[PDB]
Amino acid sequence: KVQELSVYEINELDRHSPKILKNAFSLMFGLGDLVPFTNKLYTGDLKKRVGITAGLCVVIEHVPEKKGERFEATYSFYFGDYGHLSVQGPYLTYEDSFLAITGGAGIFEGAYGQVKLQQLVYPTKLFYTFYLKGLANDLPLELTGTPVPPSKDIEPAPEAKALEPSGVISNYTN
Amino acid sequence: KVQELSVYEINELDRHSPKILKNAFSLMFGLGDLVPFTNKLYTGDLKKRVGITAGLCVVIEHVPEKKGERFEATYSFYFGDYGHLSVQGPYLTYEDSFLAITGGAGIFEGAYGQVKLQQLVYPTKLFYTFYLKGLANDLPLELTGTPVPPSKDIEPAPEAKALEPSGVISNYTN
Amino acid sequence: KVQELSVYEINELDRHSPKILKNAFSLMFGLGDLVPFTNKLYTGDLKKRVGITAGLCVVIEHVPEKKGERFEATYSFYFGDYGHLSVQGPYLTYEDSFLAITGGAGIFEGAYGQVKLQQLVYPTKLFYTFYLKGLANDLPLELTGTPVPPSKDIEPAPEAKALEPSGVISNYTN
């Protein structure tokens, strides 16, 4: 069975990220450019800080027709002591995409399926919906609150941005 | 149940690829050298352009006794509107290898198994056979035409090279 | 059915590894720094050389309060003619972690699950415990011997370090 899990990834610009290694033949982004990154991750209902994303975007090409870039991305999503999910696939700055769920650990051991990536504000706000298969158990209720509908205006709960106990999961990843 | 899917990956020299990021203290490839890449991808029967490969080869070592290199590769195969497959594992310039199928998306959601990489003409032509498990449905017929047996002299159909509708899949990746 | 598999990873200083690609503006590791690496891999009982590890550590952040680093790692474990296992996940220099098994090839085709990483000497000796599902067959007995108790003092069997027939698996990876 599929268990839907939604999360918001927010770049609050306080993690030295993105770091752009610029090597391409072109002034614009192009093959050769690498972007290691790490953003914050919140629950789909925006009530709690869960952890971080972490990994590498490999630039594949500039896409002038779409005024954007194609990256190939390899990264993980960290949920404090619950574990993590890993993914691989396309990040297009100009449109939504789906990535492969390559596996997980902790409660996410056995994870497979795909995840939808929706960019809400370039490059600071993204919304994901994992269509998760393979998990041993139902997801914890803490993570499965009704998601806030995605739009450019979303913000995590103030207590979650503030790292108050009510706004974080235990040992949220940082 | 295994569904075999074969494709040809061709470097037509028009995608700025490969891009070599040099760090090893050697005239030869060595650990430290990174090689982002993206080549064109055609059906196993060579009749249609499907998309591209995209990702990163990490040089592991030069192998003088084999006159070649070992890379560790993490990358995806894009099939236009159908989705993508992702892989991880060894690319040896000097011999065939098997890589892990880490997952997929679109029609390839749930994909697992291994893929055989056959190096046909270095560095411009490779032939792959995915031994695909976990797919929801039989693959579309236009992807499963009897493959052209691999040889150094294979060429995509002229319609596929020229990007005519009869020689491409819908929204073929570029 | 889960099959447990333990192996030792040792940096014997003869593979040019690790290579530190320094891009962060600090003397400390930081986002931007990339570390391609490849170490030797021995059985859990330390009697046999099996192969190598090979891949890339991406620095995510320095963790000064823990006197260590967080990396996001993408790499494979090579077992000679047996095949390989691929992983994605966290490597923290200051505490044990679990990584996702993203897939495998050979006897490891269909592999999934998670793997524990335990550092014994930073960064030259590590001990892993794979929790493997999905395999077609029971693991070969030469890989499932009782592990040597993990400590900073572990050493491969003399025959294995010297690459004598009795101390290696067939076509052990190098």
Q: A69 near A63, Cβ under 8 Å? A: yes
| CA-based nearest residue to B125, from B11, B41, B46, B6 | B11
Peptide bond preceding C90 in cis form (omega within 30 of 0):
no
Distances (CA, A) of B46 to B34, B40, B151, B161: 30, 12, 12, 10
**Which residues are paired to C87 by β-bridges?**
C75, C101
Three state DSSP letters for A19-68? CCECCCCCCCCCCCCEEEECCEEEECCCCCEEEEEEEEEEEEEEEHHHCE
Q: Is the four-CA dihedral C23, A70, A118, C72 of positive or negative sign?
A: negative
Rg (CA), chain A: 16
User: Across chain B, where does the E strand assignment appear?
Assistant: 3-10, 34-37, 40-43, 49-63, 68-78, 83-92, 97-106, 112-121, 125-133
Which residues lie closer than 8 Å to A118 by C-beta, 6 or more apart?
A96, A126, A127, A128, A129, A150
Q: What's the rounded Cα separation, in Å, for the pair C133 and B121? A: 37
Question: A88-91: which pairs have CB atoms within 8 A and are 24 or more residues apart?
Answer: A88/B74, A88/B76, A88/B86, A88/B88, A88/B102, A88/B103, A88/C88, A88/C102, A89/B76, A89/B84, A89/B86, A89/B105, A90/B54, A90/B76, A90/B78, A90/B84, A91/A57, A91/A117
Instruction: Write the CB contacts of A9 (distance below 8 Å, at least 6 apart in sequence).
Output: A39, A40, A41, A42, A53, A77, A125, A126, A127, A128
The single residue listed with the structure tokens 């070969």 is C140
* Alpha carbon distance A81, C90 (integer Å): 13
Q: How far is CA B112 from CA A46, A122, A135, B147, in A?
A: 33, 32, 16, 21
| DSSP letters spanning C70-90 | EEEEEEEEE-GGGEEEEEEEE
Class of residue B120 by CB neighbours under 10 A (exposed 0-12, middle 13-18, buried 19+): middle
d(CA C63, CA B1): 46
Alpha-carbon torsion, ordered B82, B88, B94, B96, to 10 deg: -60
Record: contact C86-B88, CB cut-off 8 A: yes
Q: Are B157 and B165 in contact (CB under 8 A)?
A: no
DSSP class of residue C20 equals -
Cross-chain residue pair B16–A24, CB shorter than 8 Å: yes
C-beta separation of B89 from B100 below 8 A: yes
Cα separations in angstroms, A117 against A51, A92, B134: 18, 9, 22
Separation between Cα atoms, residue C127 and residue A141, nearest integer Å:
34
Residue B161 parent element (H or E): helix B158-161
> CA-to-CA distance for C97 and A173, rounded, in angstroms?
13
Q: Do B31 and C21 touch (CB under 8 A)?
A: no
For residue B18, whether the previous peptide bond is cis, meaning omega lies within 30 degrees of 0, is yes
DSSP symbol at C161: H
How far is it, in rounded angstroms, from Cα A87 to Cα B8? 25
**Phi (first) and psi of residue C124, to 5 degrees:** -85, -15
- Give me the residue label for tokens 């310039």: B93
Give the residues across from C58 on adjacent strands: C34, C72
The nearest CA of chain A is from the CA of C158 a distance in Å of 35
Exposure of A76 by Cβ count < 10 A (0-12 exposed, 13-18 middle, 19+ buried)? Answer: buried
How many whole angstroms separate alpha carbon C84 and alpha carbon C153? 27
Partnered with residue A36 across adjacent β-strands are A56
Q: Is C49 within 8 Å of C42 (Cβ atoms)?
A: yes
CA distances (Å), origin B101, targets B126, B130, B131: 17, 8, 9
Give me the residue label for tokens 């030792």. Answer: C8
CA nearest neighbour of B52 among B27, B91, B102, B15 = B15
Chain C residue whose CA is closest to A102: C102
CA distance A29 to B145: 37
- Which residue in chain B has the smallest CA separation from C104? B100
In this structure, are residues C102 and A102 in contact, taking their beta carbons and an 8 Å threshold?
A: yes
Token pair 């693959």 in the structure block, residue = B139
CA distance A18 to B7: 35
Backbone angles phi, psi at B64, to 5 degrees: -60, -35
Q: Own/partner pairs for C144-150, CB < 8 Å, 24+ apart?
A: C144/C5, C144/C44, C145/C43, C145/C44, C145/C45, C145/C47, C146/C44, C146/C45, C147/C6, C147/C44, C147/C45, C148/C8, C148/C44, C148/C45, C148/C46, C150/C118, C150/C120
Option in A59, A70, A100 nearest B103 (CB): A100
Q: Please, which residues have CB within 8 angstroms of residue B138's CB and are 6 or more apart in sequence?
A: B3
CATH number of A1-174: 2.40.480.10
The encoded tokens of residue C137 equal 């067959």
CA distance A153 to chain B (A): 29
| CB nearest A31 (choices: B16, B75, B88) | B16
Report the neighbours of B using a cutoff of 3 or more CB pairs below 8 angstroms: A, C
Method: X-ray
Count Cα atoms within 13 angstroms, Cβ side, for A26: 14
CA distance B43 to chain A (A): 20
The pair of three-digit structure tokens given for residue C165, joined into one six-digit string = 């027939």
Do A114 and B86 meet the contact criterion of CB atoms below 8 Å apart? no
Q: Hey, what amino acid is at B131?
A: Y
Where is chain B broken, named by the residue before each break, C–N > 2.5 Å? none
Q: Mutate one of A74, A99, A171 to test the C interface: name it (highest C CB count within 10 A).
A: A74
